[PDB]
């Protein structure tokens, strides 16, 4: 029954920045006859699998960057990145081994950077798509920092508020960006009652919200 | 090399059964511990249980959280590792990876599998529509996309240009409504590359057995 926390549950550092996590058992991990200590940790970066960095507390795993150490005794143990990279990005987890086994719940690693405008794109709803009575219209709001933005939708000049469903990607392991996908879904019927169809990104970037817009008319 | 692969993955429903296996290769399979550890879609990893070596008699343990629930065996003929899961339920919807555990000496999982997806869910399964976005209009680069609409269960895998087309994608996680899936995928190329050159998604629906092409064209 070892409890394992870990702190903070998430923070954002900018590339080159040291940075401190922390892994609390409920147990000491300090195994008596092999005088150390069984607790290791674990990197995993969005969409992959789980990657050894450090075991038994302070021993780095080949491969591994110097730039990550562990440290700590008996209860209290900490992951220190000495000078953050975009691709250091992840979610990191300390796991006691010390009576079976048990993960912490995990510190969300983000990294800041400067803030950037989204590149947006829309697209028309596909013939494919029409044919068998349906719209959607899509609306792509690429590499943006920072994650808050806001999208707002325009039929024939007014604002439609139904049917709009956004996605946000994991942070980019390379630029630190953020993107997002917009989708409106309407019936054949409705998408075929009105013309114009308007994507409005507001970022904090700029005062003036940036506008795609297709006609279909112009199809 | 080390190689660790889980497979059995997928929909099965709410009381049912299924069996997951980890096939291994490129280490003397018998001289370690296995663990199985699971995590449920945007959650934290979750230690399941483990099958000690051949010095320890292959015996076995488990979490609380499915003690007497999941069975863990090993082949040490093939090299393979199963977990027996029983009586599933919405809790139990996670991908779930093996990895290599203790020799004896060594207190590290030292290598894991790819993970595989498994959903409790009576819903049942629907393949995608695959749908091209193609750009309208003059610039450096041009985003393209496709859209994979109405599908279920997760996952479905997104590439462009057979896996050869990699920086400058983004697949949008998917969003559920209705009990169905949608999801997305951008690409940006240089605009000297399309349409001159062919830009296509391949999207696979493993559930359904789906494999699509969608060329995007002007
Ligand atoms: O329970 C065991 O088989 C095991 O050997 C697993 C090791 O990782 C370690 O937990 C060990 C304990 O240190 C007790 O020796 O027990
Ligand atoms: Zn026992």
């Known amino acids: 029954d070892i409890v394992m926390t870990q702190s903070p549950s998430s923070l954002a550092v900018s590339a080159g920045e040291k940075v401190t996590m922390n892994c609390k058992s409920s147990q000491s991990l300090l195994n008596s006859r092999t005088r150390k200590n069984y607790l290791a940790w674990y990197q995993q970066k969005p969409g992959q699998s789980p990657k050894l960095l450090i075991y038994?507390?302070?021993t780095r795993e080949s491969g591994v960057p110097d730039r990550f150490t562990g440290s700590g005794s008996g209860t209290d143990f900490a992951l220190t990145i000495s000078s953050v990279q975009a691709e250091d990005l992840a979610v990191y987890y300390c796991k006691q081994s010390y009576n079976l086994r048990t993960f912490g719940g995990g510190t969300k690693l983000e990294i800041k950077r400067a803030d950037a405008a989204p590149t947006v794109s829309i697209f028309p709803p596909s013939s494919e798509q029409l044919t068998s009575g349906g719209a959607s219209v899509v609306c792509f709001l690429n590499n943006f920092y920072p994650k808050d933005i806001n999208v707002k939708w325009k039929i024939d000049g007014s604002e439609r508020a139904n049917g709009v469903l956004n996605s946000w990607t994991d942070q980019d392991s390379k630029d630190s960006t953020y993107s997002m996908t917009s989708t409106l879904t309407l019936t054949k019927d409705e998408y075929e009652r009105h013309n114009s169809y308007t994507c409005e990104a507001s970022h904090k970037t700029s005062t003036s919200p940036i506008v795609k817009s297709f006609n279909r008319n112009e199809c | 090399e080390v190689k660790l692969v889980e497979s059995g993955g997928g929909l099965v429903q709410p009381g049912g059964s299924l069996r997951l296996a980890c096939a291994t290769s490129?280490?003397?399979?018998?001289?370690?511990?296995m663990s199985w550890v699971r995590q449920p879609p945007g959650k934290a990893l979750e230690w399941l249980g483990f099958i000690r070596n051949k010095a320890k008699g292959y015996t076995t343990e488990y979490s609380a959280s499915v003690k007497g629930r999941f069975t863990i065996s090993r082949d040490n003929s093939q090299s393979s590792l199963y977990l027996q899961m029983n009586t599933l339920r919405a809790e139990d919807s996670a991908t779930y990876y093996c990895?290599?555990?203790?020799?004896?000496?060594?207190?590290?999982?030292?290598?894991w599998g790819q993970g595989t997806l498994v959903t409790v869910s009576a819903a049942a399964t629907t393949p995608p529509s695959v749908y091209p976005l193609a750009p309208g209009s003059t610039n450096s680069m041009v985003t393209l996309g496709c859209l994979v609409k109405g599908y279920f269960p997760e996952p479905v895998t997104v590439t462009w240009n057979s896996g050869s087309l990699s920086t400058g994608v983004h697949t949008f996680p998917a969003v559920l409504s209705s009990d169905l899936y949608t999801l997305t995928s951008s690409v940006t190329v240089p605009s000297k590359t399309w349409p001159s050159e062919t830009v296509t998604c391949n999207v696979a629906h493993p559930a359904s057995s789906t494999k699509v092409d969608k060329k995007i064209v002007p």
């Open positions: 490129g280490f003397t399979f018998t001289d370690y511990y």
């Open positions: 990895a290599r555990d203790h020799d004896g000496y060594y207190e590290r999982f030292a290598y």
């Open positions: 038994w507390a302070s």
